[PDB]
């Protein structure tokens, strides 16, 4: 993994994320939602669990993006949890949780759940 | 379980559900959100997995409520997945998914996730 994870990944909706997998489990980079403007770039930080594998398993990882930059402050944050699978068609399969800041009465409906698959192509 | 499940359950937000656990895995009843009017009662249907247990495990179950009745049509449905634990302080611990009907562009944000614990008191 590590090397394999480092790079640019794209999902099915048009988002892109560029990440660097550092020697001791760190993931750092940027997530960009769309248009192709600085206004859609947000910082992302996460971790990955590097393992000796002898049976083709995926590498578990996760990262967070707080939706605030110099052009937008969406009062929310998204975390993606999944695994990296390398090879010809390397992909990162994830499930995500997006939570928005709410008042306590609305807390019950503050989190959305979904999934995303990212590829290098 | 079965017998133990049959009855009225209340959650921490004020909702109440009355359910009948039928001999062959069926769960049928009503869910009521609040006020104490017919307008908050919705039909619920689900299933439970009845097991010989020799080690104190919970009974897995799940049910669905479509948010439509003669007074409201919220264009959504909620499913609760969890387990029944009986005894002095019997409870049903669940995680739920609420999906609203959306257009395809908004599908990505159509499902909320949460948890609920129901008790007999």
């Amino acid at each position: 993994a590590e090397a394999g994870i480092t790079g640019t990944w794209y999902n099915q909706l048009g988002s892109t994320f560029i990440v660097t997998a550092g020697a001791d489990g760190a993931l750092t980079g940027t997530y960009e939602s769309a248009v192709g403007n600085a206004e859609s770039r947000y910082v992302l930080t996460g971790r990955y669990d590097s393992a000796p594998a002898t049976d083709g398993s995926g590498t578990a990882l996760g990262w967070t993006v707080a939706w605030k930059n110099n052009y937008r402050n969406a009062h929310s944050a998204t975390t993606w949890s999944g695994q990296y699978v390398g090879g010809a068609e390397a992909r990162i399969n994830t499930q995500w949780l997006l939570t928005s800041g709410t008042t306590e009465a609305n807390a019950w409906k503050s989190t959305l759940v979904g999934h995303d698959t990212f590829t290098k192509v | 379980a079965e017998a133990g499940i049959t009855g009225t359950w209340y959650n921490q937000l004020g909702s109440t559900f009355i359910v009948t656990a039928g001999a062959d895995g069926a769960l049928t009843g009503t869910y009521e959100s609040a006020v104490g009017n017919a307008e908050s009662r919705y039909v619920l249907t689900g299933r439970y997995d009845s097991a010989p247990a020799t080690d104190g495990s919970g009974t897995a179950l799940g049910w669905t409520v479509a948010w439509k009745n003669n007074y409201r049509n919220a264009h959504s449905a909620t499913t609760w997945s969890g387990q029944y634990v009986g005894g002095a302080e019997a409870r049903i611990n669940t995680q739920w998914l609420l999906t609203s009907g959306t257009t395809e562009a908004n599908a990505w944000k159509s499902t909320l996730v949460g948890h609920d614990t129901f008790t007999k008191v």
């Binding site: 048009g14 939602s33 769309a34 859609s40 939706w67 969406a74 997006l98 | 562009a105 908004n106 990505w108």
Partner: peptide, 8 residues
């Protein structure tokens, strides 16, 4: 119009 969707 959330930053996690398209576009924006």
């Amino acid at each position: 119009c959330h930053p996690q969707g398209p576009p924006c």
